[PDB]
Amino acid sequence: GPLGSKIASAREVIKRDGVIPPEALTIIEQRLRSDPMFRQQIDNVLADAECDANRAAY
Amino acid sequence: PLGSKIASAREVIKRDGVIPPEALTIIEQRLRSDPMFRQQIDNVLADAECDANRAAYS
Protein backbone atom coordinates (compact mmCIF):
# COMPACT_ATOMS: atom_id res chain seq x y z
CA GLY A 1 0.00 0.00 0.00
CA PRO A 2 0.96 3.67 0.08
CA LEU A 3 2.86 3.36 3.39
CA GLY A 4 4.79 0.32 2.16
CA SER A 5 5.66 2.31 -0.96
CA LYS A 6 7.08 5.13 1.16
CA ILE A 7 9.21 2.62 3.11
CA ALA A 8 10.43 1.11 -0.17
CA SER A 9 11.57 4.53 -1.35
CA ALA A 10 13.37 5.18 1.96
CA ARG A 11 15.20 1.85 1.46
CA GLU A 12 16.41 3.18 -1.87
CA VAL A 13 17.88 6.29 -0.25
CA ILE A 14 19.93 4.06 2.00
CA LYS A 15 20.92 1.73 -0.88
CA ARG A 16 21.80 4.48 -3.37
CA ASP A 17 23.07 7.30 -1.17
CA GLY A 18 24.12 5.69 2.11
CA VAL A 19 21.96 8.15 4.05
CA ILE A 20 19.32 7.16 6.60
CA PRO A 21 16.32 9.48 6.20
CA PRO A 22 14.06 10.36 9.13
CA GLU A 23 11.41 7.71 8.46
CA ALA A 24 14.07 5.01 8.23
CA LEU A 25 15.74 6.28 11.39
CA THR A 26 12.49 5.96 13.34
CA ILE A 27 11.95 2.38 12.04
CA ILE A 28 15.53 1.51 13.08
CA GLU A 29 14.89 3.06 16.51
CA GLN A 30 11.70 1.02 16.91
CA ARG A 31 13.82 -2.03 16.05
CA LEU A 32 16.25 -1.08 18.88
CA ARG A 33 13.30 -1.41 21.24
CA SER A 34 11.76 -4.57 19.76
CA ASP A 35 14.76 -6.76 18.95
CA PRO A 36 17.36 -7.50 21.63
CA MET A 37 19.72 -8.88 19.00
CA PHE A 38 19.62 -5.69 16.89
CA ARG A 39 19.97 -3.58 20.05
CA GLN A 40 23.18 -5.54 20.75
CA GLN A 41 24.33 -5.22 17.11
CA ILE A 42 24.07 -1.43 17.20
CA ASP A 43 25.83 -1.30 20.57
CA ASN A 44 28.63 -3.40 19.02
CA VAL A 45 29.02 -0.99 16.07
CA LEU A 46 29.37 1.92 18.47
CA ALA A 47 31.60 -0.02 20.87
CA ASP A 48 34.02 -0.72 18.01
CA ALA A 49 34.25 3.03 17.46
CA GLU A 50 34.47 3.97 21.16
CA CYS A 51 37.24 1.57 22.19
CA ASP A 52 39.52 2.78 19.40
CA ALA A 53 38.72 6.42 20.15
CA ASN A 54 39.17 6.17 23.92
CA ARG A 55 42.83 5.18 23.57
CA ALA A 56 43.65 7.73 20.87
CA ALA A 57 45.73 10.86 21.41
CA TYR A 58 43.99 13.08 18.88
CA PRO B 1 36.76 13.85 22.63
CA LEU B 2 35.16 11.29 20.31
CA GLY B 3 35.30 8.41 22.79
CA SER B 4 33.17 9.89 25.56
CA LYS B 5 30.75 11.35 22.99
CA ILE B 6 30.22 7.83 21.64
CA ALA B 7 29.92 6.40 25.15
CA SER B 8 27.20 8.90 26.05
CA ALA B 9 25.33 8.14 22.81
CA ARG B 10 25.48 4.38 23.55
CA GLU B 11 23.75 5.06 26.84
CA VAL B 12 21.00 7.10 25.14
CA ILE B 13 20.41 4.18 22.77
CA LYS B 14 20.31 1.68 25.65
CA ARG B 15 17.98 3.82 27.77
CA ASP B 16 15.66 5.45 25.23
CA GLY B 17 16.19 3.48 22.04
CA VAL B 18 16.73 6.64 19.99
CA ILE B 19 19.91 7.47 18.10
CA PRO B 20 21.68 10.79 18.71
CA PRO B 21 23.05 12.66 15.64
CA GLU B 22 26.62 11.89 16.65
CA ALA B 23 25.81 8.12 16.74
CA LEU B 24 23.99 8.29 13.43
CA THR B 25 27.24 9.57 11.93
CA ILE B 26 29.04 6.42 13.05
CA ILE B 27 26.20 4.16 11.88
CA GLU B 28 26.21 5.74 8.42
CA GLN B 29 29.99 5.36 8.14
CA ARG B 30 29.62 1.68 9.11
CA LEU B 31 26.99 0.97 6.45
CA ARG B 32 29.15 2.75 3.86
CA SER B 33 32.12 0.55 4.81
CA ASP B 34 30.55 -2.81 5.74
CA PRO B 35 28.46 -4.77 3.24
CA MET B 36 26.92 -7.02 5.87
CA PHE B 37 25.83 -4.14 8.12
CA ARG B 38 24.38 -2.33 5.09
CA GLN B 39 22.27 -5.41 4.36
CA GLN B 40 21.30 -5.80 8.03
CA ILE B 41 19.87 -2.27 7.97
CA ASP B 42 18.02 -3.06 4.75
CA ASN B 43 16.58 -6.20 6.38
CA VAL B 44 15.10 -4.10 9.21
CA LEU B 45 13.43 -1.80 6.69
CA ALA B 46 12.28 -4.74 4.51
CA ASP B 47 10.44 -6.23 7.49
CA ALA B 48 8.70 -2.89 8.12
CA GLU B 49 7.71 -2.67 4.44
CA CYS B 50 6.39 -6.25 4.47
CA ASP B 51 4.35 -5.62 7.62
CA ALA B 52 2.99 -2.34 6.20
CA ASN B 53 1.80 -4.33 3.17
CA ARG B 54 -0.05 -6.92 5.30
CA ALA B 55 -3.29 -8.33 3.99
CA ALA B 56 -6.01 -5.84 4.82
CA TYR B 57 -9.33 -4.46 3.67
CA SER B 58 -9.28 -1.04 2.00
Residue numbers in the entry:
A (entry chain B): -3 to 0, 210 to 263
B (entry chain A): -2 to 0, 210 to 264
Original authors' sentences:
C. elegans SAS-6 physically interacts with SAS-5, a protein that shuttles rapidly between the cytoplasm and centrioles throughout the cell cycle. The presence of SAS-6 and SAS-5 at centrioles is essential for formation of the central tube, a cylindrical structure at the core of the emerging centriole.
The SAS-5 Implico domain comprises a novel type of protein dimer. Each chain features three α-helices (A1 to A3 and B1 to B3) that interact in a pairwise manner (A1–B3, A2–B2 and A3–B1). We found that this newly recognized domain is highly conserved amongst Caenorhabditis species. These dimers cannot be disrupted even when diluting the protein to concentrations as low as 20 nM. We envision that SAS-5 would readily dimerize even at low concentrations via the Implico domain, as oligomerization of this domain is tighter compared to that of the SAS-5 coiled coil. As anticipated, coiled coil disruptions in either SAS-52–265 L141E or L141E/M167E mutants yielded a stable dimer in SEC-MALS experiments, mediated by the Implico domain. SEC-MALS analysis of the same construct shows a concentration-dependent trimerization, again consistent with formation of just the SAS-5 coiled coil. Our work shows that formation of these tight SAS-5 dimers through the Implico domain is necessary for SAS-5 localization to centrioles.
